[PDB]
Amino acid sequence: MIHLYDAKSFAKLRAAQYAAFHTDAPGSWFDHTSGVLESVEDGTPVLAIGVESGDAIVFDKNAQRIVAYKEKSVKAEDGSVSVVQVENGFMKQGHRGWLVDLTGELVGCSPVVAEFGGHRYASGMVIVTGKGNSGKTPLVHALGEALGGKDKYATVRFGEPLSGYNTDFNVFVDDIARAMLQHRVIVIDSLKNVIISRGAFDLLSDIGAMAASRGCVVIASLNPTSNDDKIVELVKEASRSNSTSLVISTDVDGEWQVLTRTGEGLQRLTHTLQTSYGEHSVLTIHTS
Amino acid sequence: MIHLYDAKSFAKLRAAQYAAFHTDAPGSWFDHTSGVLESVEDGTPVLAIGVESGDAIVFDKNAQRIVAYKEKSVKAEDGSVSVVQVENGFMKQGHRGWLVDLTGELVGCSPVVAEFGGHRYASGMVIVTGKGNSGKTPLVHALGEALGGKDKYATVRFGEPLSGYNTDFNVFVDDIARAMLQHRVIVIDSLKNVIISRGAFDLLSDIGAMAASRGCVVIASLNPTSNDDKIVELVKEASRSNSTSLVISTDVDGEWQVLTRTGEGLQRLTHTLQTSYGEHSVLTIHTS
Amino acid sequence: MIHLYDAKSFAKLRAAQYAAFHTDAPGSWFDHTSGVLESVEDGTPVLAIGVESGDAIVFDKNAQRIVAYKEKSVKAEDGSVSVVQVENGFMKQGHRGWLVDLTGELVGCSPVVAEFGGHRYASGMVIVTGKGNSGKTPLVHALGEALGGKDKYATVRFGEPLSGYNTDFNVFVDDIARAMLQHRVIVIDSLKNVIISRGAFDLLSDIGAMAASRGCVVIASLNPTSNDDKIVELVKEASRSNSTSLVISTDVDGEWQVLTRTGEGLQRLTHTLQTSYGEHSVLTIHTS
Amino acid sequence: MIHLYDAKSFAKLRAAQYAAFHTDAPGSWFDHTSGVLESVEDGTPVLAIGVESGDAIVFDKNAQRIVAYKEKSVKAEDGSVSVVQVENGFMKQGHRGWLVDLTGELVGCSPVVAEFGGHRYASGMVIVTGKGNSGKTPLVHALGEALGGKDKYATVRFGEPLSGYNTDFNVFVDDIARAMLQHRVIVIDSLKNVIISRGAFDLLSDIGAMAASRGCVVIASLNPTSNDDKIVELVKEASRSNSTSLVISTDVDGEWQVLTRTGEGLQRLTHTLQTSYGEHSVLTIHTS
Amino acid sequence: MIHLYDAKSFAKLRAAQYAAFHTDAPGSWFDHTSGVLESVEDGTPVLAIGVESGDAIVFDKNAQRIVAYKEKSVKAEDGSVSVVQVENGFMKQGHRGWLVDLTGELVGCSPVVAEFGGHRYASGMVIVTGKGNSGKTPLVHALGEALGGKDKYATVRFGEPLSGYNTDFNVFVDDIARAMLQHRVIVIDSLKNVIISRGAFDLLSDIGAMAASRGCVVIASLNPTSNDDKIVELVKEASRSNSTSLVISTDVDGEWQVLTRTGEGLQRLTHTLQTSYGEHSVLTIHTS
Amino acid sequence: MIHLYDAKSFAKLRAAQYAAFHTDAPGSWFDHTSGVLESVEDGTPVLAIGVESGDAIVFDKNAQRIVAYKEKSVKAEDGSVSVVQVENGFMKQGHRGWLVDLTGELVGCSPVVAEFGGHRYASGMVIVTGKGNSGKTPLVHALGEALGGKDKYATVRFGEPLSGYNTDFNVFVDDIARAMLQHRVIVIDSLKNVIISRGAFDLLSDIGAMAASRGCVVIASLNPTSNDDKIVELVKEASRSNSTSLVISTDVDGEWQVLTRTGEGLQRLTHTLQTSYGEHSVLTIHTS
Ligand SMILES: Nc1ncnc2c1ncn2[C@@H]1O[C@H](COP(=O)(O)OP(=O)(O)O)[C@@H](O)[C@H]1O
Ligand SMILES: Nc1ncnc2c1ncn2[C@@H]1O[C@H](COP(=O)(O)OP(=O)(O)O)[C@@H](O)[C@H]1O
Ligand SMILES: Nc1ncnc2c1ncn2[C@@H]1O[C@H](COP(=O)(O)OP(=O)(O)O)[C@@H](O)[C@H]1O
Ligand SMILES: Nc1ncnc2c1ncn2[C@@H]1O[C@H](COP(=O)(O)OP(=O)(O)O)[C@@H](O)[C@H]1O
Ligand SMILES: Nc1ncnc2c1ncn2[C@@H]1O[C@H](COP(=O)(O)OP(=O)(O)O)[C@@H](O)[C@H]1O
Ligand SMILES: Nc1ncnc2c1ncn2[C@@H]1O[C@H](COP(=O)(O)OP(=O)(O)O)[C@@H](O)[C@H]1O
Numbered sequence A, B, C, D, E, F: 001m002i003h004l005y006d007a008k009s010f011a012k013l014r015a016a017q018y019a020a021f022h023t024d025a026p027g028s029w030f031d032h033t034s035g036v037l038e039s040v041e042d043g044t045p046v047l048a049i050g051v052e053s054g055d056a057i058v059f060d061k062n063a064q065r066i067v068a069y070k071e072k073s074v075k076a077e078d079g080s081v082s083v084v085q086v087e088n089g090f091m092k093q094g095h096r097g098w099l100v101d102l103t104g105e106l107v108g109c110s111p112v113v114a115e116f117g118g119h120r121y122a123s124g125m126v127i128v129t130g131k132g133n134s135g136k137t138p139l140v141h142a143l144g145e146a147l148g149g150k151d152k153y154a155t156v157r158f159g160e161p162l163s164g165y166n167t168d169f170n171v172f173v174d175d176i177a178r179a180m181l182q183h184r185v186i187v188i189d190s191l192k193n194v195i196i197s198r199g200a201f202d203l204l205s206d207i208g209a210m211a212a213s214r215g216c217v218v219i220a221s222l223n224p225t226s227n228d229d230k231i232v233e234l235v236k237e238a239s240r241s242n243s244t245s246l247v248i249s250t251d252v253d254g255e256w257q258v259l260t261r262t263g264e265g266l267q268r269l270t271h272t273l274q275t276s277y278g279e280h281s282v283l284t285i286h287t288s
């Protein structure tokens, strides 16, 4: 909804956004939204995401699809009304994104999702890209494991000519939706087939905000299939724009640069990652 | 409608347009249109704005959507007829923009919305853009607070991968419509996802005129996601064209240039803004 | 319709076309067509113009829209048949343009619309363009007043982010239609939003001929929002092509060049205009 | 239909095609096809041409439109079947072009349409183009009068911002159809608005063959509104391709070059035209 | 259908494909397929070809169109099923191309269609192109007569502004279908209007295979209307790709180069042709 | 579906993926999936592939098309549901690709399909491309025979102007589907007509994953019809991206480079192939 501010309430907002990344316990936002989701009335639509055509499918708190749901409205503090209606498996009324409020007044954050190697990482979408045909796949997996920490990370596979890989966009958004509804750390191996259909365009536009609001973090590989020219600059550009954080390869083997948006109007941070391969190409990110 | 003029009535018009920016009390036009709006017959359609498809949704004076409204015509002094009809939540007959006359004979103005730091600022749409990845967000907020003055400013969030950010275009125009119907100072953080769908194109084309007629002022961030080439010149160009005022970054840190259209065929003005950051990236615009 | 000629009747035609610009009393064609229009059977469709979709709306002699009109045919001298039919507010059968004959055998003229400062000006469409972000607006208004002479000129406002400006294309063509049906001198401030929809393309293609046939003159501002490169050459080009007359800015402040098509296959004329600003940006065109 | 040949019948065909341009009396083919048309059963569809949408309207021998015609088939010598069916004013079955056979075995000709100034001119389509903004209009008219000889030439006006000019494509094809059904010499002033809609594309593709088959000759002005660059080379190119003859301006004032296709696989001829202006821009083509 | 091979059966296939061009009696494949076609059950669909829309029309062995045909399936050795169904004049089920098997296991051939001047020529599609505005027409005709040998060749005329020339794409494919069903040597004068509609694209993609399977040879003129730049290289490229054989003009007057694909994975051959003009532009290809 | 991992289960996965290419017996995966397929309930949909329109057709284990299949759902370990429904010959519900699980937890492999000349070759899709108009056809066949080893390889022919070649995209996917359901080694001669329709785009996106999952290997020829410029770099690029393995021609006659993806995030391997022609263009790949 819309929010009103004067100097004083704006300064409080910024302080809270700053704390959401810098001082809140890592993964606390995720635990908080998981709590909000489980308190959702059984059967209530909680998430809507676009499929290939541009239409949207809807899920409940247990990541089960909703196919029929009689129109229901909700009045916000803003005075604005929220309406949701599902019919024949598709949203008849509503909007893409979260259908229940996970944030309230606290918006514009990049909730800390985890801490590793002396650095805090933001929830939201992280695109791993850069100098083509490098080791993006091993990197998204190492990041997944490291950010997972005590927990397992979820892997969404899509659009690679390898065994067991789904290449149908509608199965892909179904996996993404389930992943965000159930896990704090998600890896998407290849946003290749995505970047264009309306559903695909919808995804690039919505995923970061959906993850950041949940407090989960989606680590997506984007190997520029495009030339190995300066088209990689445009890819990086498009990526910076729809990503909460960016991870780009450098001219130094095994080294990557992490660029993080810490919150609305807040400072962008950067740190470097050193990595190395073990057996069977398992990559390890060096810490101390 | 159309207006007729001879030398004498034209000179009077220009004098009045000149006064609307230069000598009228800041925010007086807004107060006046608020008065016109509240005297509108209950239930009367007052504003129509386009959604993603190109269709338009309609609101009443209290920023509540109208879904059903039997056809109604109105004869203007011009002899032209205005017809409005809403059905199934969409305008069946009418036009995008204000559906009740807020201006009358007094058109082509950039009604002073506020005065700050020795400068008068126009109502209408203000696009904040320029040299990519700068501090556009902190700037739109500081401008919002400063122009708000004694009042709070309204913030419309859209299309950024941060918590609580709507990324659905139809929710976006709903937020904009409510904002203009209810507040004199409005901030839109990111016209990114907009600049293309018909609704988006409609918005760029309509928003400035809608705001200027209301006397409100919409301060919109436009971070060129495009290259950091001379595509920024085209962005600036597109922005100049659909903006009442333009605010662009310069080669000097914290400095911005404000270019203002003071009214139809009137002189374009320019002044500079100096700014600095405080705690939690709160930006302050220097005055004296 | 089609016309047949041998050397003799062709020489007569050219003489008459030459007289229509050079020797007929200024504005006499307009008065003549006004006469033809008022002698039109009440309720008869007299003008059809395209709306955004490409469909056309129809007006009667009093500039009132026709929504229902049973099919009616008319046999021309040519042997060709003219059919008009309106249904549900849209032309079911007919063509864009004048639906009653205002010219007869006398076609291919640029009927003198007025004389000012020692020069005769043609009816039809006049596009004021050139070296971007100049004083096009003040110029179209000064030209409007000057060509109006004893009469007031009609102003059609469209697509500018200023108070009271319509930005809906369908209201725009409605204003244009009323303007041409009722006034000899018309000013269109900004063909910006137009130059693309089918309605818009229809307008560029039809307006000049409609005005020339009526004997009215439409003075349209066209500020190339495009680069300030040599794209202005293409704009000028597109403008020359659909304009009866062109008015372009020069490298000399306040100076403009007027290029006029005096009629079918006749000589194109050129003269220069000197102008200066007064109070509140009112522009004056120097004469003697 | 298709035709079979061996060396002997092919040599006869070429001889006949050669005679159709070089030795047949000028305009004899036209008189012959007029005879074929008048012997057509009353009400029989004789010509189909495409309108803007790509659909086709159909005419009878008197240039009257057919709106209803029950399906009718015809078996050709080729074994191929020709079917025509009109419904609701549009061809339901058939093809664009002549619906009755005007040629028989004699195809691939450029039937001499007239002789003037010591040169024979082909029927078919003649595009007058070249070095932009020249005197194309005066030239098509002089050619019209000269080729008309003892007869008057027909003028089809279209898409110029001048009085009485139709700018609706569907009225345009109606004029062209009537013109070819009734006159040997036709002038089209401006193929501008045409060169793109399907109807327009259909016209460029069909007009030459339709005229050549009738033995009439359409002299069409094509002023490249495009740049005055080497885009004129592409225009000329597109023109050469769909024209039976080309008439292009040269670097010498009043001089034009005529390039003629004399028939299928036959020699292309070229000759030059000298012209000069008289009173009221009437152009005269010098002969002896 | 699909075919299985091991080293031995593959070597046999290549030997047979080699023989189909190099040692089989010229035109023997055509005679063989003519035999297969005449043994087809009366009324059986034998050929399907696409019309402008992308839909397909169907013919029987006598080149008569089929408009109604109840669904019928056929099981191949491959296990694959072939289904054909015609309704309302269009294929409801089936595929473009031959609907009865003319080849069996013997596929990937360029069956010798004729021998002339010491060279064997392949069946399939032959595109005659190169250095624009040359003598492509005279060449396709001389080739048609020479390859015809004892038989007449069939001429399909299309898209040229000359008398009797069809310019409707749907009549064109009807002519092509009949030609291939009935003659071993076919000339198409101008693939101009074709190279784009779906039917046209279908034709470029299907014609070579259809002809090669029949054993007939289609000699098509392709005059690049495009620039006379190096766009001719792209034309040649597109032509090489969809042609069984290519015939291109050279820098030497009257000389042409013939490039032939002799079969699947077999050697491409080249030889030169010398030609000269006789009376009425009849071209003769020199032999001994 | 999605998979969860911690460091330990991820290391096991990589080990198993490494074994799937490096140590499993060649062709063992194919035999395994053949087993899974034959244990599939009779009539069960096992494969869905897209046709030209973008819709998908469905096959059973015996490569027979399914036209009617009442909706059936399946709950995965993931919690995700799989639904399949066929109606009127098209998938009403489901996804493109394998409809029964052939992989389970073991995904992201490039199952060894065969071993020849001291090298192991991956299943999945292999595109043979490079320096235009070379010997791609002979190469795909030699590779087919060699990888077939003791078995015959299946050949799918498409879009070449040669006898017996299908050029209809829908017959093409039917052949591909049957080939993958029934053979371990498949050759597709020409992906030309493919690289664009939605079906075609679907194929490029799906084929590699389908083959890799089955453990079969599709050897597809891709002769860049495009320029012989550096467009071949883009072709190679697009090819690398959707291929499990790439085979490219080099500057050395008869030599080719094989680039293999050995599995998810695993090392890409490269080796060289030397070849030579025998009688009738049969190509032999040198081993020892
Ligand atoms: N042990 C290793 N040492 C060096 N490079 C490796 C090792 N293991 C894997 N790689 C690289 O990791 C990448 C494999 O994952 P893949 O997804 O195909 O790459 P990409 O990130 O280019 O899309 C390849 O570029 C491969 O060469
Ligand atoms: N205290 C600060 N000092 C300097 N720069 C800051 C400070 N705080 C925030 N910024 C800058 O403000 C911007 C953050 O807002 P954001 O919307 O992401 O930027 P942008 O205007 O480029 O779209 C970043 O470019 C960030 O680096
Ligand atoms: N008194 C004046 N002296 C010089 N320039 C003026 C004066 N008044 C107005 N202008 C110029 O007239 C133009 C205002 O009308 P506007 O429609 O916005 O311009 P444009 O023709 O570029 O589209 C501006 O470019 C403005 O700077
Ligand atoms: N008497 C004349 N002397 C020289 N030029 C003339 C004369 N009369 C007309 N013209 C030229 O003929 C042309 C007028 O016809 P028009 O259709 O507008 O031209 P175009 O062929 O460029 O499209 C103009 O270019 C005009 O300047
Ligand atoms: N006797 C001849 N001598 C030289 N050239 C000739 C002769 N007869 C015809 N031609 C050429 O043959 C061609 C005519 O056929 P056409 O189809 O129009 O040509 P194109 O192959 O360029 O499309 C022309 O280029 C013409 O100049
Ligand atoms: N014996 C041979 N010696 C050299 N080249 C050969 C031999 N046999 C066939 N070729 C080449 O193999 C190719 C034939 O197969 P084709 O599919 O048409 O080629 P491409 O791979 O270019 O698409 C041709 O380029 C041909 O010249």
Ligand SMILES: [Mg+2]
Pocket (backbone or CB within 6 Å): A136, A137, A189, A190, A221, A222, A223
């Ligand atoms: Mg990857």
Ligand SMILES: [Mg+2]
Pocket (backbone or CB within 6 Å): B136, B137, B189, B190, B221, B222, B223
């Ligand atoms: Mg911003």
Ligand SMILES: [Mg+2]
Pocket (backbone or CB within 6 Å): C136, C137, C189, C190, C221, C222, C223
């Ligand atoms: Mg202006």
Ligand SMILES: [Mg+2]
Pocket (backbone or CB within 6 Å): D136, D137, D189, D190, D221, D222, D223
């Ligand atoms: Mg002209």
Ligand SMILES: [Mg+2]
Pocket (backbone or CB within 6 Å): E136, E137, E189, E190, E221, E222, E223
């Ligand atoms: Mg030709």
Ligand SMILES: [Mg+2]
Pocket (backbone or CB within 6 Å): F136, F137, F189, F190, F221, F222, F223
């Ligand atoms: Mg090949």
